[PDB]
Amino acid sequence: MRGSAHVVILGAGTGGMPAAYEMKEALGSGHEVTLISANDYFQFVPSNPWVGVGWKERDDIAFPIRHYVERKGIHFIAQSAEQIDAEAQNITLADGNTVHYDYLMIATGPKLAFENVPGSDPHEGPVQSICTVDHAERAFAEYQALLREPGPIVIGAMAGASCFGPAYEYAMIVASDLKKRGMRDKIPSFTFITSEPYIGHLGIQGVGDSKGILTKGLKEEGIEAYTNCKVTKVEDNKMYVTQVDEKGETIKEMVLPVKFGMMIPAFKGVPAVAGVEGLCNPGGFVLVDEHQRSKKYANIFAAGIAIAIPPVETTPVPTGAPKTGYMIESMVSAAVHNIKADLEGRKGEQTMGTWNAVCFADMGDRGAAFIALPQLKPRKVDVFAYGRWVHLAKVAFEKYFIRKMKMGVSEPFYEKVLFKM
Amino acid sequence: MRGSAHVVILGAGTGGMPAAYEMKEALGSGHEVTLISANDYFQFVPSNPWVGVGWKERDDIAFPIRHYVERKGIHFIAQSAEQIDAEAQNITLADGNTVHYDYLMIATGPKLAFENVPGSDPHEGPVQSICTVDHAERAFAEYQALLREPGPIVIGAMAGASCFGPAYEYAMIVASDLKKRGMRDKIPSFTFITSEPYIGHLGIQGVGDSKGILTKGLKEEGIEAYTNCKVTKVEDNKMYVTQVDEKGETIKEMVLPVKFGMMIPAFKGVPAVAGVEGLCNPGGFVLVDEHQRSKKYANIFAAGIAIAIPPVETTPVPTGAPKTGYMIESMVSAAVHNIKADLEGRKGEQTMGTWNAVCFADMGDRGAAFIALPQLKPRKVDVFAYGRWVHLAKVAFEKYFIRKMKMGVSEPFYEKVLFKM
Ligand SMILES: Cc1cc2nc3c(=O)[nH]c(=O)nc-3n(C[C@H](O)[C@H](O)[C@H](O)COP(=O)(O)OP(=O)(O)OC[C@H]3O[C@@H](n4cnc5c(N)ncnc54)[C@H](O)[C@@H]3O)c2cc1C
Numbered sequence: 001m002r003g004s005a006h007v008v009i010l011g012a013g014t015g016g017m018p019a020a021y022e023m024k025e026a027l028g029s030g031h032e033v034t035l036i037s038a039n040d041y042f043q044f045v046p047s048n049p050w051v052g053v054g055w056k057e058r059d060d061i062a063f064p065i066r067h068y069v070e071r072k073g074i075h076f077i078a079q080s081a082e083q084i085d086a087e088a089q090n091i092t093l094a095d096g097n098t099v100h101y102d103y104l105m106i107a108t109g110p111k112l113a114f115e116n117v118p119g120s121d122p123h124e125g126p127v128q129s130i131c132t133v134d135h136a137e138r139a140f141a142e143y144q145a146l147l148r149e150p151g152p153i154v155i156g157a158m159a160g161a162s163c164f165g166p167a168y169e170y171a172m173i174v175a176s177d178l179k180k181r182g183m184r185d186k187i188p189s190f191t192f193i194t195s196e197p198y199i200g201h202l203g204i205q206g207v208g209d210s211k212g213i214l215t216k217g218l219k220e221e222g223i224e225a226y227t228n229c230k231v232t233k234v235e236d237n238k239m240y241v242t243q244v245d246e247k248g249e250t251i252k253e254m255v256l257p258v259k260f261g262m263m264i265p266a267f268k269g270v271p272a273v274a275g276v277e278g279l280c281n282p283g284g285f286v287l288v289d290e291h292q293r294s295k296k297y298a299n300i301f302a303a304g305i306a307i308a309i310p311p312v313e314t315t316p317v318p319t320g321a322p323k324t325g326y327m328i329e330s331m332v333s334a335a336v337h338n339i340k341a342d343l344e345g346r347k348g349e350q351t352m353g354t355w356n357a358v359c360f361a362d363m364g365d366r367g368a369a370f371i372a373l374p375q376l377k378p379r380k381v382d383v384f385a386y387g388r389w390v391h392l393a394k395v396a397f398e399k400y401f402i403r404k405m406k407m408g409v410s411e412p413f414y415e416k417v418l419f420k421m
Numbered sequence: 422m423r424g425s426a427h428v429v430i431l432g433a434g435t436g437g438m439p440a441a442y443e444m445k446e447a448l449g450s451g452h453e454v455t456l457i458s459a460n461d462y463f464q465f466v467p468s469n470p471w472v473g474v475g476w477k478e479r480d481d482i483a484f485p486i487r488h489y490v491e492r493k494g495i496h497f498i499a500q501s502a503e504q505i506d507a508e509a510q511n512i513t514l515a516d517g518n519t520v521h522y523d524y525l526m527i528a529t530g531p532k533l534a535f536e537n538v539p540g541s542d543p544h545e546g547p548v549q550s551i552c553t554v555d556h557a558e559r560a561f562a563e564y565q566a567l568l569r570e571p572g573p574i575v576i577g578a579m580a581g582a583s584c585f586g587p588a589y590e591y592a593m594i595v596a597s598d599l600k601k602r603g604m605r606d607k608i609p610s611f612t613f614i615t616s617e618p619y620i621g622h623l624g625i626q627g628v629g630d631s632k633g634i635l636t637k638g639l640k641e642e643g644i645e646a647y648t649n650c651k652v653t654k655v656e657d658n659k660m661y662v663t664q665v666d667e668k669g670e671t672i673k674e675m676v677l678p679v680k681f682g683m684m685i686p687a688f689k690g691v692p693a694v695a696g697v698e699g700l701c702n703p704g705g706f707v708l709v710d711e712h713q714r715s716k717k718y719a720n721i722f723a724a725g726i727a728i729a730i731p732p733v734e735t736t737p738v739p740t741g742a743p744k745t746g747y748m749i750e751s752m753v754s755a756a757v758h759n760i761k762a763d764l765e766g767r768k769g770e771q772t773m774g775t776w777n778a779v780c781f782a783d784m785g786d787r788g789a790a791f792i793a794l795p796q797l798k799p800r801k802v803d804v805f806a807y808g809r810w811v812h813l814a815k816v817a818f819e820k821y822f823i824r825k826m827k828m829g830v831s832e833p834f835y836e837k838v839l840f841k842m
Pocket residue numbers: 010011012013014015016036037038039045046047048049079080081082107108109110130131163166270272303304305306323324325326328358359360361
């Protein structure tokens with residue numbers, strides 16, 4: 001309200017949950033901060049691949065949100081937004097209630113566009129997914145069912161995907177698990193299918209020796225890999241694959257039977273956000289400026305996977321670049337600062353900073369991780385590392401982040417640099 | 422003097438030059454800051470290997486100090502200290518003059534202990550060195566003489582060495598240069614001799630896949646490599662090598678003829694510092710606490726290669742761990758803060774922080790670099806990277822640091838992190 005702005009954060013994920021705490025800390029008791037999310041629980045998404053192979057469980061990586069944000073003075077609504085009226089500044093919830101805002105920060109993450117590939121929805125066939133804890137459990141359940149009746153395996157990433165690390169990770173840990181149970185030899189064909197133009201492109205034109213290391217890894221595990229692939233449909237428990245050349249021409253079509261499958265889908269913007277006239281690009285991603293502010297609506301900000309970031313290359317089969325945790329947090333931090341500035345008469349000048357991608361993939365005792373920045377080459381940092389110390393860092397970070405999400409974030413978040421100081 | 426403390430910095434190198442600027446900035450016009458050094462010029466030491474192969478020249482990497490520090494109010498004495506009387510707080514210079522201090526910060530770097538291996542001094546035989554710009558020129562001169570009368574090459578690192586990166590670097594660029602001139606095939610034997618227990622140990626128990634990458638690199642260039650080696654003497658243009666086993670027992674003795682050679686020597690503390698009773702360990706390195714303060718003299722601080730750091734392993738052939746640039750700068754920053762604190766009644770609490778090693782080795786179009794921390798495994802960061810982007814960073818950093826040494830340093834030096842912000 002006038003003189004007491006009401007700020008709403010839409011989505012309680014990697015970006016949204018920190019956004020709620022930070023917003024409240026920034027604004028204080030004089031302003032209302034409301035967090036709205038489809039689920040009543042936070043999940044640490046980088047852990048989902050492990051849930052999907054049964055190496056972690058839901059209660060290790062998820063917890064109920066209400067108590068933690070409420071004790072900070074944050075209002076929590078465990079309801080999905082179905083409609084956003086940018087003109088009246090009203091959000092319509094699933095239960096038909098409306099919530100008014102003075103400022104809105106959209107942190108809704110990805111819509112999993114299973115509809116791009118008929119039959120690829122985890123509920124429509126054998127092709128599962130590990131992006132959400134709900135789906136990773138379903139993935140594991142199916143994995144258990146492959147244990148009973150072994151058959152062909154197909155793991156990978158669909159056309160349009162932007163999140164490739166997890167595909168490599170899932171394929172490696174499945175291989176690893178097939179052995180620790182002792183049943184790898186029961187598989188007629190383990191196949192990696194990706195829209196990447198080459199192994200380890202990762203949607204970022206490769207990083208360090210990602211190609212050689214990942215290529216060698218898949219071979220070591222007896223996994224046959226195909227690049228430049230798009231799945232046209234999943235039907236009758238068969239995946240129909242078209243492989244193309246550098247110019248898009250078909251070089252082969254394949255019909256792969258699937259007993260157990262997992263393909264990372266393409267991401268789009270969620271429907272409530274995509275549905276706002278003039279807010280988004282055609283993929284449903286919010287068009288924002290360097291300050292995280294909507295180009296159309298001055299009182300709408302956005303952060304996380306939800307924002308649009310222009311491509312910098314165009315691959316034979318459509319692919320996207322990932323939006324990862326450190327950059328997401330920088331976007332959140334910028335949006336919070338600049339909303340505060342708005343409430344006080346100034347144009348916030350804070351930006352998300354240099355584009356970067358960071359990803360940690362834990363294999364069990366050793367992990368691989370990459371750091372790349374900026375987006376285009378030649379980069380200032382282009383590192384792909386492998387070692388047990390990567391595994392140890394992933395373990396350490398998940399523990400940290402989950403704790404921070406329960407205890408609150410002030411904060412110039414990552415002073416996770418004082419492993420130096 | 423009383424109420425107006427006189428601070429002396431001994432040595433104008435990677436640690437000492439920044440120390441002078443920072444000290445002066447910290448203290449201001451009310452205190453005298455004197456910088457004393459053996460040479461009247463600063464040299465960027467990581468560039469010396471390239472000087473040693475003729476890929477850089479002295480005037481690209483060195484410049485006269487006087488004007489730059491004097492215009493900051495810093496007094497500069499281009500004289501070597503020969504004696505330090507810790508009790509009277511008097512430094513005796515080469516010309517017999519004495520300089521009194523209230524606080525002394527020792528930044529004298531390494532004494533190159535060529536005397537450990539009879540005949541290994543660059544002026545005594547064919548075994549040269551690239552640690553100083555003076556010696557790297559002499560190295561190149563000899564390289565030019567091998568071009569005229571080709572013969573056996575031996576590059577590597579002596580027992581007791583702590584600086585291995587440069588040995589690998591020099592060996593690779595020499596190979597590279599032998600080809601760009603087209604004369605590699607004229608060499609009867611190119612041999613890498615190291616005190617490391619294995620290739621890529623680097624005095625730090627390896628980092629990432631340093632072993633595999635360096636091993637492969639030496640093979641690619643047609644260089645035969647021997648580990649666990651100590652050179653007993655260089656004589657008659659022959660290097661006498663003893664190779665040992667895990668327990669120190671001789672497993673072979675070798676006599677290698679050398680037309681052109683380069684071995685990184687062991688480092689000790691310089692004589693003026695080692696000569697101070699009770700100041701140093703037996704190697705002549707200053708014993709300091711976490712605050713960079715001498716354990717014996719409260720008004721003596723130290724930074725850089727000059728300080729003692731306890732070993733954490735004991736290798737078949739004696740080796741040391743390197744002291745590198747970022748950690749050196751942290752030591753300098755700590756010493757400055759804590760001297761200032763002393764001048765104002767408090768115990769400075771600032772430390773050098775977590776032990777770390779960083780090293781960049783430029784091969785020409787691509788470079789290798791490593792980052793390791795902390796000292797013992799399992800580490801929080803254990804990365805060894807290779808790529809043209811490493812070369813680009815080395816180029817960028819040398820330009821930066823040289824500029825900073827002419828323009829002055831405030832400073833919380835490395836905010837060379839805003840390639841993020
Ligand atoms: C399998 C996987 C592994 C990954 N691993 C890493 C990694 O190791 N490192 C890294 O840096 N990044 C990783 N990422 C990427 C990125 O960090 C995560 O995707 C991160 O969770 C994205 O943050 P976000 O806040 O944009 O979206 P999310 O975390 O997905 O949160 C969006 C929130 O909005 C909610 N929401 C959606 N629609 C509505 C609606 N209409 N109304 C109300 N709420 C709604 C959702 O329920 C969700 O809570 C990984 C991603 C995936 C999929």
